[PDB]
PDB file of all heavy atoms in Angstrom:
ATOM      1  N   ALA A  29      11.482 -54.737 -31.491  1.00  0.00           N
ATOM      2  CA  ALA A  29      11.743 -54.857 -30.063  1.00  0.00           C
ATOM      3  C   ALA A  29      12.273 -56.218 -29.658  1.00  0.00           C
ATOM      4  O   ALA A  29      13.058 -56.313 -28.722  1.00  0.00           O
ATOM      5  CB  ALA A  29      10.464 -54.575 -29.283  1.00  0.00           C
ATOM      6  N   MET A  30      11.857 -57.278 -30.336  1.00  0.00           N
ATOM      7  CA  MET A  30      12.036 -58.627 -29.819  1.00  0.00           C
ATOM      8  C   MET A  30      13.117 -59.458 -30.497  1.00  0.00           C
ATOM      9  O   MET A  30      13.538 -60.461 -29.936  1.00  0.00           O
ATOM     10  CB  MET A  30      10.711 -59.383 -29.873  1.00  0.00           C
ATOM     11  CG  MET A  30       9.556 -58.633 -29.243  1.00  0.00           C
ATOM     12  SD  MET A  30       9.924 -57.951 -27.440  1.00  0.00           S
ATOM     13  CE  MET A  30       9.787 -59.618 -26.496  1.00  0.00           C
ATOM     14  N   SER A  31      13.556 -59.065 -31.691  1.00  0.00           N
ATOM     15  CA  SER A  31      14.587 -59.829 -32.379  1.00  0.00           C
ATOM     16  C   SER A  31      15.871 -59.042 -32.477  1.00  0.00           C
ATOM     17  O   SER A  31      15.859 -57.913 -32.968  1.00  0.00           O
ATOM     18  CB  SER A  31      14.171 -60.190 -33.794  1.00  0.00           C
ATOM     19  OG  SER A  31      15.247 -60.876 -34.406  1.00  0.00           O
ATOM     20  N   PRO A  32      17.001 -59.639 -32.053  1.00  0.00           N
ATOM     21  CA  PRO A  32      18.282 -58.940 -32.157  1.00  0.00           C
ATOM     22  C   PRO A  32      18.869 -58.855 -33.565  1.00  0.00           C
ATOM     23  O   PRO A  32      19.786 -58.070 -33.820  1.00  0.00           O
ATOM     24  CB  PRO A  32      19.195 -59.781 -31.261  1.00  0.00           C
ATOM     25  CG  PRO A  32      18.634 -61.157 -31.337  1.00  0.00           C
ATOM     26  CD  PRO A  32      17.147 -60.937 -31.359  1.00  0.00           C
ATOM     27  N   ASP A  33      18.372 -59.685 -34.464  1.00  0.00           N
ATOM     28  CA  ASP A  33      18.902 -59.743 -35.807  1.00  0.00           C
ATOM     29  C   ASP A  33      18.380 -58.597 -36.631  1.00  0.00           C
ATOM     30  O   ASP A  33      17.214 -58.216 -36.523  1.00  0.00           O
ATOM     31  CB  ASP A  33      18.538 -61.076 -36.438  1.00  0.00           C
ATOM     32  CG  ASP A  33      19.291 -62.216 -35.802  1.00  0.00           C
ATOM     33  OD1 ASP A  33      20.526 -62.209 -35.900  1.00  0.00           O
ATOM     34  OD2 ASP A  33      18.675 -63.108 -35.201  1.00  0.00           O
ATOM     35  N   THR A  34      19.249 -58.060 -37.482  1.00  0.00           N
ATOM     36  CA  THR A  34      18.862 -56.967 -38.329  1.00  0.00           C
ATOM     37  C   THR A  34      19.341 -57.154 -39.753  1.00  0.00           C
ATOM     38  O   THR A  34      20.273 -57.911 -40.029  1.00  0.00           O
ATOM     39  CB  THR A  34      19.316 -55.583 -37.802  1.00  0.00           C
ATOM     40  OG1 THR A  34      20.726 -55.468 -37.931  1.00  0.00           O
ATOM     41  CG2 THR A  34      18.938 -55.372 -36.369  1.00  0.00           C
ATOM     42  N   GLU A  35      18.652 -56.521 -40.688  1.00  0.00           N
ATOM     43  CA  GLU A  35      19.107 -56.506 -42.067  1.00  0.00           C
ATOM     44  C   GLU A  35      19.000 -55.082 -42.605  1.00  0.00           C
ATOM     45  O   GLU A  35      18.066 -54.347 -42.289  1.00  0.00           O
ATOM     46  CB  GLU A  35      18.366 -57.544 -42.947  1.00  0.00           C
ATOM     47  CG  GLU A  35      16.869 -57.331 -43.130  1.00  0.00           C
ATOM     48  CD  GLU A  35      16.232 -58.252 -44.165  1.00  0.00           C
ATOM     49  OE1 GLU A  35      16.866 -59.244 -44.578  1.00  0.00           O
ATOM     50  OE2 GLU A  35      15.083 -57.973 -44.564  1.00  0.00           O
ATOM     51  N   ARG A  36      19.992 -54.711 -43.412  1.00  0.00           N
ATOM     52  CA  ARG A  36      20.088 -53.400 -44.043  1.00  0.00           C
ATOM     53  C   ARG A  36      19.240 -53.443 -45.321  1.00  0.00           C
ATOM     54  O   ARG A  36      19.499 -54.239 -46.207  1.00  0.00           O
ATOM     55  CB  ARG A  36      21.538 -53.070 -44.389  1.00  0.00           C
ATOM     56  CG  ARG A  36      21.728 -51.688 -45.008  1.00  0.00           C
ATOM     57  CD  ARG A  36      23.152 -51.547 -45.439  1.00  0.00           C
ATOM     58  NE  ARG A  36      23.440 -50.336 -46.205  1.00  0.00           N
ATOM     59  CZ  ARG A  36      23.903 -49.208 -45.679  1.00  0.00           C
ATOM     60  NH1 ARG A  36      24.035 -49.081 -44.361  1.00  0.00           N
ATOM     61  NH2 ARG A  36      24.208 -48.183 -46.476  1.00  0.00           N
ATOM     62  N   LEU A  37      18.225 -52.595 -45.414  1.00  0.00           N
ATOM     63  CA  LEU A  37      17.340 -52.604 -46.562  1.00  0.00           C
ATOM     64  C   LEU A  37      18.081 -52.225 -47.837  1.00  0.00           C
ATOM     65  O   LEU A  37      18.898 -51.305 -47.863  1.00  0.00           O
ATOM     66  CB  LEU A  37      16.173 -51.649 -46.346  1.00  0.00           C
ATOM     67  CG  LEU A  37      15.205 -52.027 -45.220  1.00  0.00           C
ATOM     68  CD1 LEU A  37      14.207 -50.895 -45.018  1.00  0.00           C
ATOM     69  CD2 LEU A  37      14.485 -53.337 -45.510  1.00  0.00           C
ATOM     70  N   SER A  38      17.762 -52.945 -48.903  1.00  0.00           N
ATOM     71  CA  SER A  38      18.254 -52.654 -50.232  1.00  0.00           C
ATOM     72  C   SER A  38      17.058 -52.811 -51.171  1.00  0.00           C
ATOM     73  O   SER A  38      16.712 -53.932 -51.555  1.00  0.00           O
ATOM     74  CB  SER A  38      19.405 -53.608 -50.557  1.00  0.00           C
ATOM     75  OG  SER A  38      19.872 -53.415 -51.868  1.00  0.00           O
ATOM     76  N   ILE A  39      16.410 -51.694 -51.472  1.00  0.00           N
ATOM     77  CA  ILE A  39      15.148 -51.694 -52.186  1.00  0.00           C
ATOM     78  C   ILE A  39      15.300 -50.930 -53.482  1.00  0.00           C
ATOM     79  O   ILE A  39      15.676 -49.768 -53.495  1.00  0.00           O
ATOM     80  CB  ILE A  39      14.020 -51.132 -51.287  1.00  0.00           C
ATOM     81  CG1 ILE A  39      13.788 -52.054 -50.077  1.00  0.00           C
ATOM     82  CG2 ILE A  39      12.747 -50.965 -52.081  1.00  0.00           C
ATOM     83  CD1 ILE A  39      12.820 -51.510 -49.022  1.00  0.00           C
ATOM     84  N   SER A  40      15.006 -51.617 -54.580  1.00  0.00           N
ATOM     85  CA  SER A  40      15.154 -51.075 -55.928  1.00  0.00           C
ATOM     86  C   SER A  40      14.417 -51.862 -57.011  1.00  0.00           C
ATOM     87  O   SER A  40      14.559 -51.551 -58.188  1.00  0.00           O
ATOM     88  CB  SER A  40      16.636 -51.001 -56.316  1.00  0.00           C
ATOM     89  OG  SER A  40      17.189 -52.295 -56.357  1.00  0.00           O
ATOM     90  N   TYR A  41      13.634 -52.883 -56.646  1.00  0.00           N
ATOM     91  CA  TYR A  41      13.106 -53.820 -57.655  1.00  0.00           C
ATOM     92  C   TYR A  41      12.239 -53.134 -58.705  1.00  0.00           C
ATOM     93  O   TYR A  41      12.361 -53.409 -59.898  1.00  0.00           O
ATOM     94  CB  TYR A  41      12.324 -54.931 -56.957  1.00  0.00           C
ATOM     95  CG  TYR A  41      11.914 -56.044 -57.863  1.00  0.00           C
ATOM     96  CD1 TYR A  41      12.701 -57.179 -57.994  1.00  0.00           C
ATOM     97  CD2 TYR A  41      10.738 -55.983 -58.582  1.00  0.00           C
ATOM     98  CE1 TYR A  41      12.331 -58.219 -58.841  1.00  0.00           C
ATOM     99  CE2 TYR A  41      10.354 -57.017 -59.425  1.00  0.00           C
ATOM    100  CZ  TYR A  41      11.158 -58.125 -59.555  1.00  0.00           C
ATOM    101  OH  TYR A  41      10.752 -59.141 -60.396  1.00  0.00           O
ATOM    102  N   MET A  42      11.325 -52.276 -58.273  1.00  0.00           N
ATOM    103  CA  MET A  42      10.346 -51.723 -59.196  1.00  0.00           C
ATOM    104  C   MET A  42      10.984 -50.810 -60.234  1.00  0.00           C
ATOM    105  O   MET A  42      10.723 -50.960 -61.426  1.00  0.00           O
ATOM    106  CB  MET A  42       9.250 -50.994 -58.431  1.00  0.00           C
ATOM    107  CG  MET A  42       8.446 -51.920 -57.534  1.00  0.00           C
ATOM    108  SD  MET A  42       7.080 -51.012 -56.513  1.00  0.00           S
ATOM    109  CE  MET A  42       5.786 -50.731 -57.912  1.00  0.00           C
ATOM    110  N   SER A  43      11.824 -49.874 -59.806  1.00  0.00           N
ATOM    111  CA  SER A  43      12.474 -49.003 -60.781  1.00  0.00           C
ATOM    112  C   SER A  43      13.463 -49.770 -61.649  1.00  0.00           C
ATOM    113  O   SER A  43      13.725 -49.379 -62.778  1.00  0.00           O
ATOM    114  CB  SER A  43      13.171 -47.818 -60.137  1.00  0.00           C
ATOM    115  OG  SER A  43      14.328 -48.223 -59.455  1.00  0.00           O
ATOM    116  N   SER A  44      14.022 -50.853 -61.127  1.00  0.00           N
ATOM    117  CA  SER A  44      14.950 -51.698 -61.878  1.00  0.00           C
ATOM    118  C   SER A  44      14.256 -52.523 -62.949  1.00  0.00           C
ATOM    119  O   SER A  44      14.881 -52.948 -63.919  1.00  0.00           O
ATOM    120  CB  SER A  44      15.694 -52.652 -60.938  1.00  0.00           C
ATOM    121  OG  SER A  44      16.592 -51.934 -60.104  1.00  0.00           O
ATOM    122  N   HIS A  45      12.967 -52.782 -62.744  1.00  0.00           N
ATOM    123  CA  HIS A  45      12.184 -53.664 -63.613  1.00  0.00           C
ATOM    124  C   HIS A  45      10.845 -53.028 -63.981  1.00  0.00           C
ATOM    125  O   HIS A  45       9.790 -53.598 -63.729  1.00  0.00           O
ATOM    126  CB  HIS A  45      11.984 -55.013 -62.919  1.00  0.00           C
ATOM    127  CG  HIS A  45      13.276 -55.688 -62.591  1.00  0.00           C
ATOM    128  ND1 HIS A  45      14.180 -56.050 -63.569  1.00  0.00           N
ATOM    129  CD2 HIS A  45      13.839 -56.038 -61.412  1.00  0.00           C
ATOM    130  CE1 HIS A  45      15.238 -56.595 -63.009  1.00  0.00           C
ATOM    131  NE2 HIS A  45      15.056 -56.613 -61.704  1.00  0.00           N
ATOM    132  N   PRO A  46      10.889 -51.842 -64.593  1.00  0.00           N
ATOM    133  CA  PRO A  46       9.646 -51.089 -64.812  1.00  0.00           C
ATOM    134  C   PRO A  46       8.702 -51.754 -65.812  1.00  0.00           C
ATOM    135  O   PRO A  46       7.506 -51.475 -65.805  1.00  0.00           O
ATOM    136  CB  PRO A  46      10.148 -49.740 -65.334  1.00  0.00           C
ATOM    137  CG  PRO A  46      11.461 -50.061 -65.983  1.00  0.00           C
ATOM    138  CD  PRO A  46      12.066 -51.112 -65.104  1.00  0.00           C
ATOM    139  N   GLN A  47       9.239 -52.632 -66.652  1.00  0.00           N
ATOM    140  CA  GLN A  47       8.423 -53.355 -67.619  1.00  0.00           C
ATOM    141  C   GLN A  47       7.366 -54.220 -66.953  1.00  0.00           C
ATOM    142  O   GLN A  47       6.392 -54.609 -67.596  1.00  0.00           O
ATOM    143  CB  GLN A  47       9.285 -54.264 -68.488  1.00  0.00           C
ATOM    144  CG  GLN A  47      10.452 -53.578 -69.175  1.00  0.00           C
ATOM    145  CD  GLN A  47      11.773 -53.686 -68.408  1.00  0.00           C
ATOM    146  OE1 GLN A  47      11.815 -53.834 -67.184  1.00  0.00           O
ATOM    147  NE2 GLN A  47      12.867 -53.579 -69.141  1.00  0.00           N
ATOM    148  N   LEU A  48       7.582 -54.554 -65.680  1.00  0.00           N
ATOM    149  CA  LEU A  48       6.694 -55.431 -64.951  1.00  0.00           C
ATOM    150  C   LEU A  48       5.499 -54.718 -64.310  1.00  0.00           C
ATOM    151  O   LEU A  48       4.658 -55.392 -63.720  1.00  0.00           O
ATOM    152  CB  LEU A  48       7.488 -56.175 -63.884  1.00  0.00           C
ATOM    153  CG  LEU A  48       8.721 -56.930 -64.375  1.00  0.00           C
ATOM    154  CD1 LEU A  48       9.369 -57.669 -63.233  1.00  0.00           C
ATOM    155  CD2 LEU A  48       8.388 -57.870 -65.513  1.00  0.00           C
ATOM    156  N   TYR A  49       5.423 -53.389 -64.427  1.00  0.00           N
ATOM    157  CA  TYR A  49       4.372 -52.595 -63.784  1.00  0.00           C
ATOM    158  C   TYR A  49       3.812 -51.617 -64.788  1.00  0.00           C
ATOM    159  O   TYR A  49       4.526 -50.760 -65.297  1.00  0.00           O
ATOM    160  CB  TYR A  49       4.913 -51.842 -62.566  1.00  0.00           C
ATOM    161  CG  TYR A  49       5.628 -52.768 -61.639  1.00  0.00           C
ATOM    162  CD1 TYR A  49       6.993 -52.982 -61.764  1.00  0.00           C
ATOM    163  CD2 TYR A  49       4.927 -53.510 -60.701  1.00  0.00           C
ATOM    164  CE1 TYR A  49       7.652 -53.866 -60.946  1.00  0.00           C
ATOM    165  CE2 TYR A  49       5.578 -54.407 -59.879  1.00  0.00           C
ATOM    166  CZ  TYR A  49       6.944 -54.580 -60.011  1.00  0.00           C
ATOM    167  OH  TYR A  49       7.594 -55.467 -59.206  1.00  0.00           O
ATOM    168  N   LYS A  50       2.524 -51.747 -65.059  1.00  0.00           N
ATOM    169  CA  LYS A  50       1.877 -50.938 -66.080  1.00  0.00           C
ATOM    170  C   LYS A  50       2.095 -49.437 -65.884  1.00  0.00           C
ATOM    171  O   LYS A  50       2.327 -48.710 -66.844  1.00  0.00           O
ATOM    172  CB  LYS A  50       0.383 -51.261 -66.090  1.00  0.00           C
ATOM    173  CG  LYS A  50      -0.413 -50.545 -67.146  1.00  0.00           C
ATOM    174  CD  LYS A  50      -1.823 -51.122 -67.273  1.00  0.00           C
ATOM    175  CE  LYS A  50      -2.673 -50.975 -65.988  1.00  0.00           C
ATOM    176  NZ  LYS A  50      -4.089 -51.504 -66.153  1.00  0.00           N
ATOM    177  N   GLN A  51       2.043 -48.991 -64.634  1.00  0.00           N
ATOM    178  CA  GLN A  51       2.118 -47.573 -64.300  1.00  0.00           C
ATOM    179  C   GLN A  51       3.554 -47.055 -64.217  1.00  0.00           C
ATOM    180  O   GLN A  51       3.756 -45.875 -63.927  1.00  0.00           O
ATOM    181  CB  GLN A  51       1.390 -47.314 -62.980  1.00  0.00           C
ATOM    182  CG  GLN A  51      -0.081 -47.694 -62.998  1.00  0.00           C
ATOM    183  CD  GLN A  51      -0.366 -49.068 -62.421  1.00  0.00           C
ATOM    184  OE1 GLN A  51       0.403 -50.007 -62.617  1.00  0.00           O
ATOM    185  NE2 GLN A  51      -1.503 -49.206 -61.761  1.00  0.00           N
ATOM    186  N   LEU A  52       4.528 -47.943 -64.422  1.00  0.00           N
ATOM    187  CA  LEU A  52       5.925 -47.534 -64.553  1.00  0.00           C
ATOM    188  C   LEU A  52       6.456 -47.617 -65.975  1.00  0.00           C
ATOM    189  O   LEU A  52       7.266 -46.793 -66.373  1.00  0.00           O
ATOM    190  CB  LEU A  52       6.831 -48.363 -63.641  1.00  0.00           C
ATOM    191  CG  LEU A  52       6.512 -48.322 -62.141  1.00  0.00           C
ATOM    192  CD1 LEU A  52       7.576 -49.075 -61.373  1.00  0.00           C
ATOM    193  CD2 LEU A  52       6.369 -46.894 -61.642  1.00  0.00           C
ATOM    194  N   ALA A  53       5.996 -48.609 -66.729  1.00  0.00           N
ATOM    195  CA  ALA A  53       6.586 -48.944 -68.026  1.00  0.00           C
ATOM    196  C   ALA A  53       6.628 -47.809 -69.029  1.00  0.00           C
ATOM    197  O   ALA A  53       7.524 -47.758 -69.893  1.00  0.00           O
ATOM    198  CB  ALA A  53       5.860 -50.118 -68.626  1.00  0.00           C
ATOM    199  N   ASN A  54       5.657 -46.910 -68.917  1.00  0.00           N
ATOM    200  CA  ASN A  54       5.551 -45.760 -69.822  1.00  0.00           C
ATOM    201  C   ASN A  54       5.470 -44.419 -69.090  1.00  0.00           C
ATOM    202  O   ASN A  54       5.026 -43.417 -69.665  1.00  0.00           O
ATOM    203  CB  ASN A  54       4.336 -45.939 -70.743  1.00  0.00           C
ATOM    204  CG  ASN A  54       4.584 -46.954 -71.817  1.00  0.00           C
ATOM    205  OD1 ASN A  54       5.272 -46.666 -72.802  1.00  0.00           O
ATOM    206  ND2 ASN A  54       4.051 -48.160 -71.646  1.00  0.00           N
ATOM    207  N   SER A  55       5.919 -44.400 -67.827  1.00  0.00           N
ATOM    208  CA  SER A  55       5.872 -43.205 -66.998  1.00  0.00           C
ATOM    209  C   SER A  55       7.221 -42.938 -66.379  1.00  0.00           C
ATOM    210  O   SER A  55       7.495 -43.341 -65.245  1.00  0.00           O
ATOM    211  CB  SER A  55       4.837 -43.309 -65.900  1.00  0.00           C
ATOM    212  OG  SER A  55       4.870 -42.149 -65.077  1.00  0.00           O
ATOM    213  N   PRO A  56       8.074 -42.217 -67.110  1.00  0.00           N
ATOM    214  CA  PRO A  56       9.334 -41.809 -66.512  1.00  0.00           C
ATOM    215  C   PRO A  56       9.140 -41.013 -65.227  1.00  0.00           C
ATOM    216  O   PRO A  56       9.978 -41.085 -64.336  1.00  0.00           O
ATOM    217  CB  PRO A  56       9.984 -40.969 -67.613  1.00  0.00           C
ATOM    218  CG  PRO A  56       9.433 -41.552 -68.856  1.00  0.00           C
ATOM    219  CD  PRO A  56       8.016 -41.872 -68.540  1.00  0.00           C
ATOM    220  N   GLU A  57       8.045 -40.272 -65.116  1.00  0.00           N
ATOM    221  CA  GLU A  57       7.793 -39.523 -63.905  1.00  0.00           C
ATOM    222  C   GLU A  57       7.569 -40.471 -62.729  1.00  0.00           C
ATOM    223  O   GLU A  57       8.114 -40.260 -61.648  1.00  0.00           O
ATOM    224  CB  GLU A  57       6.607 -38.569 -64.065  1.00  0.00           C
ATOM    225  CG  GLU A  57       6.436 -37.679 -62.847  1.00  0.00           C
ATOM    226  CD  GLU A  57       5.345 -36.641 -62.991  1.00  0.00           C
ATOM    227  OE1 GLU A  57       4.580 -36.691 -63.968  1.00  0.00           O
ATOM    228  OE2 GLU A  57       5.266 -35.751 -62.122  1.00  0.00           O
ATOM    229  N   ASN A  58       6.744 -41.496 -62.925  1.00  0.00           N
ATOM    230  CA  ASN A  58       6.519 -42.459 -61.845  1.00  0.00           C
ATOM    231  C   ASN A  58       7.776 -43.241 -61.506  1.00  0.00           C
ATOM    232  O   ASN A  58       8.025 -43.535 -60.350  1.00  0.00           O
ATOM    233  CB  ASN A  58       5.381 -43.422 -62.146  1.00  0.00           C
ATOM    234  CG  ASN A  58       4.005 -42.788 -61.997  1.00  0.00           C
ATOM    235  OD1 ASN A  58       3.845 -41.739 -61.353  1.00  0.00           O
ATOM    236  ND2 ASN A  58       2.990 -43.473 -62.536  1.00  0.00           N
ATOM    237  N   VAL A  59       8.558 -43.625 -62.509  1.00  0.00           N
ATOM    238  CA  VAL A  59       9.814 -44.308 -62.240  1.00  0.00           C
ATOM    239  C   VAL A  59      10.727 -43.437 -61.371  1.00  0.00           C
ATOM    240  O   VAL A  59      11.318 -43.927 -60.413  1.00  0.00           O
ATOM    241  CB  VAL A  59      10.511 -44.738 -63.544  1.00  0.00           C
ATOM    242  CG1 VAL A  59      11.955 -45.172 -63.291  1.00  0.00           C
ATOM    243  CG2 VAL A  59       9.724 -45.850 -64.202  1.00  0.00           C
ATOM    244  N   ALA A  60      10.844 -42.154 -61.696  1.00  0.00           N
ATOM    245  CA  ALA A  60      11.682 -41.259 -60.921  1.00  0.00           C
ATOM    246  C   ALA A  60      11.174 -41.120 -59.487  1.00  0.00           C
ATOM    247  O   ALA A  60      11.966 -41.116 -58.542  1.00  0.00           O
ATOM    248  CB  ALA A  60      11.800 -39.904 -61.598  1.00  0.00           C
TER     249      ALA A  60
END
């Protein structure tokens, strides 16, 4: 409501770096 500035979200870190998360590193289902 209060700030006129905006940014377009670009979110992909976790699937891009699955080695960094125990529950992604060996879970193709969770990555998907």
Side-chain angles (χ1 to χ4, degrees):
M30 309 310 285
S31 177
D33 290 298
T34 71
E35 64 171 14
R36 182 186 173 95
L37 294 173
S38 177
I39 295 173
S40 63
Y41 189 94
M42 296 178 76
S43 72
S44 291
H45 301 299
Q47 307 95 334
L48 306 183
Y49 308 91
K50 183 169 62 178
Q51 300 97 322
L52 302 186
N54 285 283
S55 177
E57 186 176 9
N58 285 342
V59 167

